[PDB]
Amino acid sequence: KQYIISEELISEGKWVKLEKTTYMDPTGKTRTWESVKRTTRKQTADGVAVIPVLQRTLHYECIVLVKQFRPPMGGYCIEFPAGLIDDGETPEAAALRELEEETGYKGDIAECSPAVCMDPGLSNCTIHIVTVTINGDDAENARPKPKPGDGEFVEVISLPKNDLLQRLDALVAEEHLTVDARVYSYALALKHAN
Amino acid sequence: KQYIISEELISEGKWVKLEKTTYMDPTGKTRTWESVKRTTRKEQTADGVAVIPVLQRTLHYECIVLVKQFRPPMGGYCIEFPAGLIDDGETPEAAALRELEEETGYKGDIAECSPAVCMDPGLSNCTIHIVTVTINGDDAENARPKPKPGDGEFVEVISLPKNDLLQRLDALVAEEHLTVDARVYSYALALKHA
Numbered sequence: 001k002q003y004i005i006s007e008e009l010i011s012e013g014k015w016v017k018l019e020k021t022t023y024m025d026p027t028g029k030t031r032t033w034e035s036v037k038r039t040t041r042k043q044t045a046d047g048v049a050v051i052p053v054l055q056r057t058l059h060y061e062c063i064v065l066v067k068q069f070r071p072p073m074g075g076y077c078i079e080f081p082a083g084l085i086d087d088g089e090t091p092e093a094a095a096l097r098e099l100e101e102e103t104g105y106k107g108d109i110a111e112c113s114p115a116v117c118m119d120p121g122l123s124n125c126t127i128h129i130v131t132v133t134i135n136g137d138d139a140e141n142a143r144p145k146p147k148p149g150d151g152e153f154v155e156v157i158s159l160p161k162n163d164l165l166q167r168l169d170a171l172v173a174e175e176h177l178t179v180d181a182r183v184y185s186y187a188l189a190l191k192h193a194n
Numbered sequence: 195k196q197y198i199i200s201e202e203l204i205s206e207g208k209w210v211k212l213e214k215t216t217y218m219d220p221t222g223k224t225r226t227w228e229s230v231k232r233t234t235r236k237e238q239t240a241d242g243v244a245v246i247p248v249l250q251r252t253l254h255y256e257c258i259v260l261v262k263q264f265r266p267p268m269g270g271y272c273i274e275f276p277a278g279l280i281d282d283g284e285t286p287e288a289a290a291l292r293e294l295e296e297e298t299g300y301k302g303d304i305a306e307c308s309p310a311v312c313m314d315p316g317l318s319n320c321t322i323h324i325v326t327v328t329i330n331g332d333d334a335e336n337a338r339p340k341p342k343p344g345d346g347e348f349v350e351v352i353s354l355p356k357n358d359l360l361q362r363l364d365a366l367v368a369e370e371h372l373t374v375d376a377r378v379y380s381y382a383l384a385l386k387h388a
């Protein structure tokens with residue numbers, strides 16, 4: 001019933017553009033929307049985010065997260081490890097690569113979502129969410145080496161899965177960080193389960 | 195270590211703008227970023243709210259109430275938590291209850307309210323509060339709930355059992371051309387993972 005009629009370029013950066021979208025509303029009236037898109041998509045999706053489940057025996061399972069300065073936010077954010085998918089890279093491969101560059105951990109794929117949207121009232125940005133387990137008892141994950149690309153500066157924060165929401169709420173109040181909505185949603189469901 | 199040096203407007207729409215952000219990297223070098231921001235954010239603690247609406251009924255499994263709408267930035271239909279922008283002077287809780295009623299017809303009760311969390315922090319400054327609300331589906335006010343859509347609002351309600359949420363979303367994606375929201379998918383993954 002609703003569909004895109006045309007798209008007008010408003011402004012095009014190196015990394016992001018703004019478009020004016022005309023679409024048919026379901027009454028048969030034509031309407032406009034301001035839409036953001038990345039300039040980098042090729043790919044199943046723009047990016048991957050990794051849910052990295054760090055498993056060490058005799059320890060709580062942790063979720064591995066990352067803290068970095070985010071210029072659009074003007075501050076530091078706590079997020080799942082994540083990055084854009086390289087041209088001709090598979091989402092699974094982007095996930096293991098990003099996880100290793102951002103955390104130093106070497107992981108195994110558990111499951112991979114379909115392309116899911118990031119903020120669909122504003123942008124067309126999508127990701128695959130890739131669940132990965134990390135055998136923290138293996139030697140390759142003993143002293144994990146974060147291999148930042150150029151211009152990336154990432155701290156690693158591992159939090160216990162079974163107290164995640166309370167741990168996140170603490171970091172916000174105590175450290176004035178911004179938690180990522182996907183991270184927060186995950187944490188909420190861990191509490192809301194049963 | 196890192197901080198914003200300057201924000202230059204590149205292009206300003208009615209609803210969205212694009213900025214060139216200059217910031218200080220942690221080596222002491224000056225760098226730039228392309229930042230998306232809304233034009234609608236004033237004194238709110240965030241741009242918007244998303245509502246996690248837990249529908250509770252005697253002798254029924256708990257359901258998560260979701261909405262399906264056409265999203266011009268995506269060029270198609272998306273399945274999302276009920277959500278909207280916070281009106282000027284409105285509290286996040288009130289915004290949540292209001293958007294839930296407008297989009298679904300249901301009258302909820304506040305459970306919890308998150309701090310402001312970021313939507314896509316490598317791209318935009320956009321933030322929401324995630325508001326968990328319970329809906330007493332035995333109350334007569336919630337027996338036969340009618341969405342009150344605004345001008346240009348056309349929303350379908352999809353209530354899915356919490357205990358099978360991820361499979362039920364997968365089955366929707368398999369049988370139709372739609373995209374699931376990444377916060378919804380994140381929430382459904384954690385429900386499985388717990």
Ligand SMILES: CCN(CC)c1cc(C)nc2ncnn12
Pocket residue numbers: 032033034035121122209210279346
């Ligand atoms: C805040 C949601 N609204 C208002 C209905 C928006 C958002 C954007 C990004 N573009 C738009 N073009 C027309 N309305 N509109």
Ligand SMILES: CCN(CC)c1cc(C)nc2ncnn12
Pocket residue numbers: 015016084151226227228229316317
């Ligand atoms: C894809 C992540 N990067 C590349 C490091 C980006 C993204 C945006 C939005 N602006 C940017 N300005 C400079 N680098 N940059």
Ligand SMILES: [Cl-]
Pocket residue numbers: 053110131387
């Ligand atoms: Cl898992």
Ligand SMILES: [Mg+2]
Pocket residue numbers: 081082083102
């Ligand atoms: Mg990254």
Ligand SMILES: [Mg+2]
Pocket residue numbers: 083101149152
């Ligand atoms: Mg990278």
Ligand SMILES: [Mg+2]
Pocket residue numbers: 276277278293297
């Ligand atoms: Mg809405």
Ligand SMILES: [Mg+2]
Pocket residue numbers: 277278293296297347
């Ligand atoms: Mg609304």
